[PDB]
Enzyme design. Structure first.
Site, mmCIF file in Angstrom:
data_model
loop_
_atom_site.group_PDB
_atom_site.id
_atom_site.type_symbol
_atom_site.label_atom_id
_atom_site.label_comp_id
_atom_site.label_asym_id
_atom_site.label_seq_id
_atom_site.Cartn_x
_atom_site.Cartn_y
_atom_site.Cartn_z
ATOM 1 C CG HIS A 64 -2.036 -1.021 1.113
ATOM 2 N ND1 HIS A 64 -2.458 -1.732 2.207
ATOM 3 C CD2 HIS A 64 -2.772 -1.385 0.033
ATOM 4 C CE1 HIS A 64 -3.435 -2.506 1.777
ATOM 5 N NE2 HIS A 64 -3.663 -2.333 0.468
ATOM 6 N NE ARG A 66 -3.777 4.719 2.823
ATOM 7 C CZ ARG A 66 -5.080 4.953 2.733
ATOM 8 N NH1 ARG A 66 -5.510 6.083 2.184
ATOM 9 N NH2 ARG A 66 -5.950 4.070 3.202
ATOM 10 C CD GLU A 67 -0.373 0.358 4.492
ATOM 11 O OE1 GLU A 67 -1.611 0.323 4.358
ATOM 12 O OE2 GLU A 67 0.328 -0.672 4.572
ATOM 13 N NE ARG A 122 -6.505 0.254 0.509
ATOM 14 C CZ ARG A 122 -6.200 -0.372 1.644
ATOM 15 N NH1 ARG A 122 -5.499 0.251 2.583
ATOM 16 N NH2 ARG A 122 -6.620 -1.613 1.854
ATOM 17 C CG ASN A 139 -3.604 -7.140 1.458
ATOM 18 O OD1 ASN A 139 -3.073 -8.173 1.057
ATOM 19 N ND2 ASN A 139 -3.842 -6.909 2.741
ATOM 20 N NE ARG A 140 -9.936 -5.407 1.205
ATOM 21 C CZ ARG A 140 -8.971 -4.936 1.986
ATOM 22 N NH1 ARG A 140 -7.710 -5.271 1.750
ATOM 23 N NH2 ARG A 140 -9.261 -4.123 2.992
ATOM 24 C CG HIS A 192 0.097 -4.124 5.132
ATOM 25 N ND1 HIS A 192 -0.846 -3.668 4.246
ATOM 26 C CD2 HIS A 192 0.574 -5.320 4.702
ATOM 27 C CE1 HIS A 192 -0.929 -4.586 3.302
ATOM 28 N NE2 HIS A 192 -0.089 -5.607 3.532
ATOM 29 C CE1 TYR A 194 -3.200 4.771 9.976
ATOM 30 C CE2 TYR A 194 -3.740 4.210 12.239
ATOM 31 C CZ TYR A 194 -4.069 4.819 11.048
ATOM 32 O OH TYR A 194 -5.279 5.464 10.923
ATOM 33 C CE1 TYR A 244 -10.247 -4.238 6.554
ATOM 34 C CE2 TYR A 244 -10.062 -2.646 8.330
ATOM 35 C CZ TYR A 244 -9.701 -3.079 7.071
ATOM 36 O OH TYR A 244 -8.775 -2.364 6.340
ATOM 37 C CD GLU A 266 -1.645 -3.245 9.201
ATOM 38 O OE1 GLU A 266 -1.112 -2.115 9.150
ATOM 39 O OE2 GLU A 266 -2.274 -3.748 8.247
HETATM 40 C C1 LIG Z 1 -4.332 1.224 8.937
HETATM 41 C C2 LIG Z 1 -4.186 -0.188 8.362
HETATM 42 C C3 LIG Z 1 -4.913 -1.179 9.280
HETATM 43 C C4 LIG Z 1 -4.697 -0.220 6.898
HETATM 44 N N1 LIG Z 1 -6.079 -0.025 6.860
HETATM 45 S S1 LIG Z 1 -6.825 1.199 5.964
HETATM 46 O O1 LIG Z 1 -7.826 0.575 5.033
HETATM 47 O O2 LIG Z 1 -5.834 1.915 5.194
HETATM 48 C C5 LIG Z 1 -7.644 2.294 7.052
HETATM 49 C C6 LIG Z 1 -7.003 3.481 7.487
HETATM 50 C C7 LIG Z 1 -7.658 4.354 8.388
HETATM 51 C C8 LIG Z 1 -8.974 4.052 8.869
HETATM 52 C C9 LIG Z 1 -9.599 4.879 9.856
HETATM 53 C C10 LIG Z 1 -8.807 5.663 10.756
HETATM 54 C C11 LIG Z 1 -9.418 6.385 11.812
HETATM 55 C C12 LIG Z 1 -10.824 6.338 11.980
HETATM 56 C C13 LIG Z 1 -11.626 5.570 11.097
HETATM 57 C C14 LIG Z 1 -11.021 4.844 10.043
HETATM 58 C C15 LIG Z 1 -9.609 2.851 8.417
HETATM 59 C C16 LIG Z 1 -8.946 1.980 7.518
HETATM 60 P P1 LIG Z 1 -4.245 -1.746 5.959
HETATM 61 O O3 LIG Z 1 -2.824 -2.017 6.212
HETATM 62 O O4 LIG Z 1 -4.654 -1.441 4.569
HETATM 63 C C17 LIG Z 1 -5.175 -3.217 6.506
HETATM 64 C C18 LIG Z 1 -5.100 -4.385 5.495
HETATM 65 C C19 LIG Z 1 -5.863 -4.087 4.184
HETATM 66 O O5 LIG Z 1 -6.871 -3.345 4.258
HETATM 67 O O6 LIG Z 1 -5.431 -4.636 3.150
HETATM 68 C C20 LIG Z 1 -5.712 -5.654 6.121
HETATM 69 C C21 LIG Z 1 -7.045 -5.654 6.621
HETATM 70 C C22 LIG Z 1 -7.611 -6.841 7.133
HETATM 71 C C23 LIG Z 1 -6.853 -8.033 7.149
HETATM 72 C C24 LIG Z 1 -5.526 -8.034 6.648
HETATM 73 C C25 LIG Z 1 -4.739 -9.332 6.586
HETATM 74 N N2 LIG Z 1 -4.837 -9.874 5.220
HETATM 75 C C26 LIG Z 1 -4.956 -6.844 6.141
HETATM 76 ZN ZN LIG Z 2 -1.876 -1.811 4.204
#
Ligand SMILES: CC(C)[C@H](NS(=O)(=O)c1ccc(-c2ccccc2)cc1)P(=O)(O)C[C@H](C(=O)O)c1cccc(CN)c1
Ligand SMILES: [Zn+2]
Length: 304
Positions: A64, A66-67, A122, A139-140, A192, A194, A244, A266
């Site tokens: 991703h 921005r990470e 992203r 990642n989808r 990833h 955060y 989630y 993360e």
């Molecule tokens: C911050 C991390 C948790 C990333 N999530 S994100 O979609 O960018 C995101 C970023 C910020 C928010 C948010 C922040 C504050 C308040 C409300 C919402 C909600 C979601 P991620 O690295 O992108 C999580 C990852 C994905 O979405 O691909 C993920 C999610 C679920 C399972 C797995 C393991 N395969 C990996």
């Molecule tokens: Zn990510």
């Protein structure tokens, strides 16, 4: 110029992959495993003391865009490997017995875009038919309950799952490489940010992996190990309940390929800075994460 305690642009990371390899050929080899949609080279660094039929651990960063702390970690890991080999007993044994396949930036096109245009980008930067909207969520985009939950079918959305599993050149390249080397790869780690978590399967459904108990115990021990350095607290568990549901993840895909140790990390922080983690936290973040990665490697090695 390149620095391990600053975020580096792609041009600099690329030059770094060439330089670190040419300066450490007895510990690193560089190979391109594909090109991105925009023609950038997807480098893979094989880190380890060269030898016949060695087992391996696969780690990628920069899914991703921005990470940025993710990209920074893969670079940090490589330097730790090369500098401490022969001196630190664990890393020496690690590199003698196995190879780390390190993929420093998967989604290079998106990463460049966060430097040039939009820091909060992203997805990839591929075009989508019938729309001006750009990009797929890598990642989808894997064949793991593909697009069945926690993913959008709309190209304009940040979790767009693509037109089909592995529709993106970048995800096809990664999946192809892992498939071509399945028999040697014993663990899959994907970095990833955060949230400060270690996640394991499954994320595309609420079902648990066969070795759920082992993965939970391993994740628990790794977060404990991480905390010993600076006090940083991680949580851990199956993806679906710990963060989630999200189908199409590389970690669930890798696991279903038969790779029994599969984790998503993360990194820092918990949202004070979020994706915009200050460069002044790069060193501490990477050092503590090193301890968890080395703990997992030590475990996996003992269980060959
Ligand atoms: C911050 C991390 C948790 C990333 N999530 S994100 O979609 O960018 C995101 C970023 C910020 C928010 C948010 C922040 C504050 C308040 C409300 C919402 C909600 C979601 P991620 O690295 O992108 C999580 C990852 C994905 O979405 O691909 C993920 C999610 C679920 C399972 C797995 C393991 N395969 C990996
Ligand atoms: Zn990510």
């Amino acid at each position: 110029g390149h620095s391990y305690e600053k975020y580096n642009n792609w041009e600099t990371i690329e030059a770094w992959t060439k330089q670190v390899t040419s300066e450490n050929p007895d510990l690193i080899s560089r190979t391109a495993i594909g090109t991105t949609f925009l023609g950038n080279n997807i480098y893979l660094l094989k880190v380890g003391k060269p030898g016949p039929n060695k087992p391996a651990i696969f780690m990628d960063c920069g899914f991703h865009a921005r990470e940025w702390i993710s990209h920074a970690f893969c670079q940090w890991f490589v330097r730790e490997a090369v500098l401490t080999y022969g001196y630190e007993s664990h890393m020496t044994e690690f590199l003698n017995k196995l190879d780390f396949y390190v993929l420093p930036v998967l989604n290079i096109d998106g990463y460049i875009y966060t430097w040039t245009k939009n820091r909060m980008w992203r997805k990839t930067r591929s075009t989508n038919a019938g729309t001006t909207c750009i990009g797929t969520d890598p990642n989808r985009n894997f064949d793991a309950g593909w697009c069945t939950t926690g993913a959008s079918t709309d190209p304009c959305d940040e979790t767009y799952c693509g037109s089909a599993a592995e529709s993106e050149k970048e995800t096809k390249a990664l999946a192809d490489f892992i498939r071509n080397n399945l028999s040697s790869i014993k663990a899959y780690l994907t970095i990833h940010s955060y949230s400060q978590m270690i996640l394991y399967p499954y994320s595309y459904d609420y079902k648990l992996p066969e070795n759920n108990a082992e993965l939970n115990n391993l994740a628990k021990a790794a977060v404990k190990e991480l905390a010993t350095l600076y006090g940083t607290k991680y949580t851990y568990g199956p993806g679906a309940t710990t963060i989630y549901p999200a189908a199409g993840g590389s970690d669930d895909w890798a696991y279903d390929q038969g790779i029994k140790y599969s984790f998503t990390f993360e990194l820092r922080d918990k949202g004070r800075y979020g994706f915009i983690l200050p460069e002044s936290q790069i060193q501490a973040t990477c050092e503590e994460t090193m301890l968890a990665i080395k703990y997992v490697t030590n475990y996996v090695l003992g269980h060959l």
